[PDB]
Design a protein around this ligand. Structure first.
Ligand SMILES: CC(C)C[C@H](NC(=O)[C@H](Cc1ccccc1)NC(=O)c1cnccn1)B(O)O
Ligand SMILES: CC(C)C[C@H](NC(=O)[C@H](Cc1ccccc1)NC(=O)c1cnccn1)B(O)O
Ligand SMILES: CC(C)C[C@H](NC(=O)[C@H](Cc1ccccc1)NC(=O)c1cnccn1)B(O)O
Ligand SMILES: CC(C)C[C@H](NC(=O)[C@H](Cc1ccccc1)NC(=O)c1cnccn1)B(O)O
Ligand SMILES: CC(C)C[C@H](NC(=O)[C@H](Cc1ccccc1)NC(=O)c1cnccn1)B(O)O
Ligand SMILES: CC(C)C[C@H](NC(=O)[C@H](Cc1ccccc1)NC(=O)c1cnccn1)B(O)O
Ligand SMILES: CC(C)C[C@H](NC(=O)[C@H](Cc1ccccc1)NC(=O)c1cnccn1)B(O)O
Lengths: 192, 180, 180, 180, 180, 180, 180, 180
């Protein structure tokens, strides 16, 4: 284990490899990754030609956390803050073979509630399998966007916010034994 | 390195004579700890003999600027500019060790500055508004009338930490934790 | 290291007496931050007692040269040359802390320089064009008539930050952020 | 590096003249060893000629603050502030080498300080409460009546370690271990 | 480190008083940038008060020796030797900031040197050929008659950058990139 | 680094004037070599002009405290404190180079100390018990009667290494080992 | 680091006042470059005001000792001892910049040395054989009669580089390489 | 680093004024090179003005102690103590550069030392046995009668290297190797 890239990427020449938190790694790690951006081939520790030829390689760095850390900074008072953090942290030999650098912004509240809409509908298909129905309301969706988002980590713990705040109280139906032919449950937690 | 581990645990150590270079270090440290975590309290340890009014109000404004609460702890001495910085902590978080000394006194020219009387009417109007600003600052932070502080800082007013609590310079005299 | 993290966040810290060596450091820092990102604003923190006119106009021209906007922030003092550098920031980005002091005064020879009267007619014509250039610079950046500044910098004109805003030295007195 | 290996084995080495900067180092070291292990005894080696009262009471309060017991060991000299810091160790853990010298004496102004008589009535009331605090501190730690210490520290009272044990400054004169 | 990033971008920063040690640094830097790329222009930033004639002609000959064009930029001051080094740049590449000062004056003995009159006829013949060499150098680089420069550097001739362009010391007054 | 390789081979090098800071280094080194191997002999090289009595008895007690035998080697000089530290080695392990100088002399106040006669009766009782302790220490280690040492250290008693062996300061004059 | 890259390209930079410590650095550098490549030419850059005769003849003998040819290049000044070191380069490899100054003069006591007349007959016989050795050295390297050099170094003989070539101090005045 | 590469090739460089700290460095270096290879010759380069007798006899005894032969090479100067260290090399391995200076002279008190006549009869008996030991040492190493050296070191005896060979200070005047 280690050298497992044979069973992954020359098993699948059409693949997508994600390098999460590349800013944490050592310099010597991506000196060996300079091959695969130039050539598309990699030399394994067991002597294989691990082709990265059709693989969409994607590197990842949250080199941006300044605004993220509250609307304050190091001064006495976005997109280009994390661009020059890559230049500060990495070597320019590594960054320029990469095709496009994609920067993500802070999500607007109207952008978050659409993600809430997409993910509340994922469990709703498993409710009408048992002829249950979460009657959807938009007042609860705004509170899920408040609780399931922070500007350091947000829209990743949104799904745990769904299962802790909705799905905990929908287990209270069968705790007090609500099955029937089907119960049209509507939940709204208090305002914050 | 023990000053690094103070600063990694968000403790700015004043320590020396408040001059320009000491004020420049703390404002660099107040804003970095503002940027590292603006919601976590900066602690400021004060063992200073004071000095400097523009260096005072450089440290004073910066520790009032930052989002973080400043926990001022007087170690053995807070004199002149440093006792104002000691009162400059957030209310409820101004601390002093039991045998720490708080020395409040009006601003003073260290050494004579020469000049024409028109030059000296301005250097005297400057130390007068240095004096009123020292008293207006120390009245916002001690809850006194700023004419009371003018009567009190007429001379050198040495405060023990128990009577710097009664004066309003600090809020808590620190109790010992020797588990013994 | 807190001065590095200021400079990595594009903050040039003036801090000390403006002399040659202090001017040499800032021009080295103004041009590096010009080359790192010429469209991102350089911030200049000023806690200086001033001094130097050729060191002033070395810092002044370089912070006027660079593509980046200079955000000048007065910390506790911008006396003499440093108040000219404080006005030298871009309009709308000249800041001061609330208890910062702005001290504008005409150029002065520190100490007597000897010489023949032909030598002294030139050293006096020099400080006269040092004086007019200090007033012409401070009139471009405060919006005054440069004869008004000659009347005002006749003596030491100490400006509080609220009345350095009214004078045009700074554009904003910085409000505090303590969560409070 | 032998001072690091003292500090890694939880030994704070006083060593030099107790001034601000020496007091600032020890309080940085007393609190780091408090945070590394608050239940394991800090040892304080004292070879100091003393000096400083606010620097004394900065070191004194911090070594009384921490959860760890302070083992004070006098090496060759514990004079003035040092001898108070030597008594400031926890009871049973105050040690001295057999030819170490303990010198207790009342506080003293190094050099004349000038001023009006109203200024000097306060600088004399200060050294009087410096004197009573030196005697009240040294009475908590030696078990004497604090008027006895006033009679004894009237002049320079040099104590040999065997008669600093009888005085209560230390608790144990250290026996030698040369296997021989 | 901002002086390294100047030197990595082929900018030699004069900055300080031209003495031996300052001349020794620049000749070390002029030849390294000659060896790194002899066809790419070295830029020389000048904020110097001058001084030294053998240190002048050490920097002067080395910046004339190298294959690279020397772009001289006057920052706030080019006095005495530094104004000769400012004219020592290649034609078309001699720059000055708009409020930079160019001060040309004949060589001078700093302080009295004693000796017999035969010793002083040689120290006076030396400063005379220091004077003619300063004028012959400054006539090659300004296009003047070297008797005109003797009349002009009879006293201290302060040149503004706009009239150091007319004098021939510099070729371009640098325009800004922020319009304020 | 040659002082590290002495210390890695358990050689403490005294070398300089015995003051506080020199005494502080050796006690740090005597205890580290005590902790590295308490059964392996520490060697102490002495080339010191002496000085200090509390710094003497700090080094003296520590080299008597440690479990390791102290091999004292006099290099070119052991004056005052140094010669007491030279005798402070373990018996049989006190060495001197053949042209080393051992200088024993009674304690002395470097410079006048002022004071009232009650202050000076104590500073004289101090140097008297400094004198008796210097003689009682040097009688334990030379096997003399301590009144003999008072007669001998009445003035400066320079001992050659061959007659410091007869005096009991050292035990062996070191023979040369040049293969020759 | 520009002095390292001179030394990595086998360039010893004299630069400063020839004293003991400057002579000690160059002899350390002359022998390392002797050991790195004894057949590749060491270049010696000279911008020195001279001074020292035993420091001269320490540098002189070492640059004559080594197998490598010494290329001496005078930068702005080769005075006294440094002009002897400038002639001390190998024939054909003694260079000077066009405005470099070569100053040859007889040895001199900096300051009065006192003593009995028997002591002063020897200090005068010393500076006489310092004088003859300076002239015998400078006659081996300039091809003059050593009585001619005594007549010429009777006073301070300033040589321009073009007339230090005619004198024999250097062999080539360096032409400029500005590609223009 | 050129002093490291001397020491890695077993060359101790004396270089500076022989005092305590210079003697302490060489004895640290003489014993490390003794421990690295006791059968390979240590080379000692001497460019020292001398000074110190106990520092002399610290270096002298250590270079006589070690198993390795000491090759003493005089560079430009061996004066007072350094000429004794120059003769202190092993026979056949005492070298000097051709224009090196060897200066032998009797020991001398730098500056007056005060005291009672009983104190001064001992400080004079000390410099007398400093004088006899300097002559007995220099007679073992030059093969002279030690009364001849007393006549010769009555005053300052400057020896050229060719007549320091005849005197017995050195054994070989070093011939040059410049391939030329
Ligand atoms: C109580 C507050 C206002 C601070 C006090 N003010 C002062 O007297 C000190 C004096 C001082 C200290 C160091 C160097 C130069 C001058 N603060 C000042 O800078 C100052 C200057 N002019 C008038 C009043 N104060 B205290 O003496 O430090
Ligand atoms: C806005 C500025 C120009 C006002 C004040 N200027 C001055 O007084 C300064 C202080 C100073 C510094 C060095 C040498 C002599 C004098 N004046 C000058 O820079 C100066 C320098 N040389 C000649 C004449 N004036 B302040 O001290 O900066
Ligand atoms: C036991 C404590 C008091 C330490 C003692 N040290 C002192 O005497 C020192 C010496 C000193 C230093 C600065 C200014 C004036 C006096 N006393 C003080 O710390 C002090 C400081 N300010 C006013 C009065 N005393 B020790 O020498 O007894
Ligand atoms: C214009 C060129 C020639 C330089 C001028 N000449 C000189 O006076 C300087 C002297 C100086 C001046 C200020 C500070 C330190 C040294 N150049 C010299 O070294 C010098 C030496 N002897 C006679 C004349 N000039 B200027 O004064 O620096
Ligand atoms: C052999 C023992 C007694 C050491 C002797 N040292 C002393 O006399 C030294 C005196 C001294 C020496 C150098 C610099 C400053 C002070 N002892 C002391 O430290 C001392 C301190 N206070 C009063 C008297 N002596 B040595 O000089 O004989
Ligand atoms: C031309 C060669 C000989 C170098 C010249 N020599 C000297 O004048 C130097 C100047 C100097 C340096 C240090 C101490 C006293 C004097 N002469 C000596 O080195 C010197 C040293 N001791 C006695 C006599 N002359 B030059 O002045 O540097
Ligand atoms: C020739 C050998 C013996 C050394 C020569 N002798 C001396 O003149 C030196 C010069 C010197 C150094 C330090 C302090 C006082 C005096 N004499 C001594 O070493 C010396 C040291 N302490 C007392 C008496 N003489 B040399 O240093 O001139």
């Amino acid at each position: 284990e280690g050298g497992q890239l044979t069973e992954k990427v020359r098993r699948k020449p059409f693949s997508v490899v994600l390098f999460d938190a590349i800013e944490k790694a050592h310099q010597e790690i991506y000196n060996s990754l300079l091959q695969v951006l130039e050539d598309g081939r990699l030399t394994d520790g067991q002597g294989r030609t691990v082709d990265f030829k059709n693989t969409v390689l994607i590197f990842t760095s949250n080199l941006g956390t300044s605004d993220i850390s509250k609307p304050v900074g190091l001064g006495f008072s976005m997109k280009q803050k994390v661009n020059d953090e890559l230049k500060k942290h990495f070597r320019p030999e590594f960054l320029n073979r990469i095709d496009d650098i994609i920067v993500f912004h802070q999500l607007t509240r109207e952008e978050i509630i659409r993600m809430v809409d997409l993910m509340i509908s994922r469990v709703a298909g498993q409710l009408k399998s048992k002829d249950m129905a979460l009657v959807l309301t938009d007042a609860a969706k705004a509170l899920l966007a408040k609780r399931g988002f922070d500007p350091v980590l947000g829209a990743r713990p949104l799904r745990r916010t769904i299962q802790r705040e909705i799905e905990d109280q929908l287990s209270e139906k069968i705790l007090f034994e609500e099955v029937g032919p089907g119960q049209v449950v509507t939940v709204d937690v208090d305002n914050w | 390195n023990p000053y690094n581990k103070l600063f990694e645990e968000r403790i700015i150590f004043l320590g020396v004579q408040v001059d320009d270079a000491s004020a420049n270090d703390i404002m660099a440290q107040l804003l970095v700890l503002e940027s590292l975590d603006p919601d976590r309290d900066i602690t400021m340890y004060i063992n200073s003999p004071g000095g400097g009014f523009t260096s005072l109000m450089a440290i004073y404004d910066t520790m009032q600027y930052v989002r973080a609460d400043i926990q001022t702890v007087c170690l053995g001495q807070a004199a002149s500019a440093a006792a104002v910085l000691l009162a400059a902590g957030t209310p409820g978080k101004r601390m002093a060790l039991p045998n720490a000394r708080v020395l409040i006194h009006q601003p003073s020219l260290s050494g004579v500055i020469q000049g024409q009387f028109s030059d000296l009417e301005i250097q005297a109007a400057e130390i007068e508004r240095m004096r009123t600003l020292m008293e207006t600052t120390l009245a916002r932070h001690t809850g006194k009338d700023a004419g009371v502080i003018r009567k009190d800082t007429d001379r050198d007013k040495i405060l023990t930490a128990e009577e710097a609590k009664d004066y309003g310079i600090i809020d808590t005299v620190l109790e010992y934790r020797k588990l013994s």
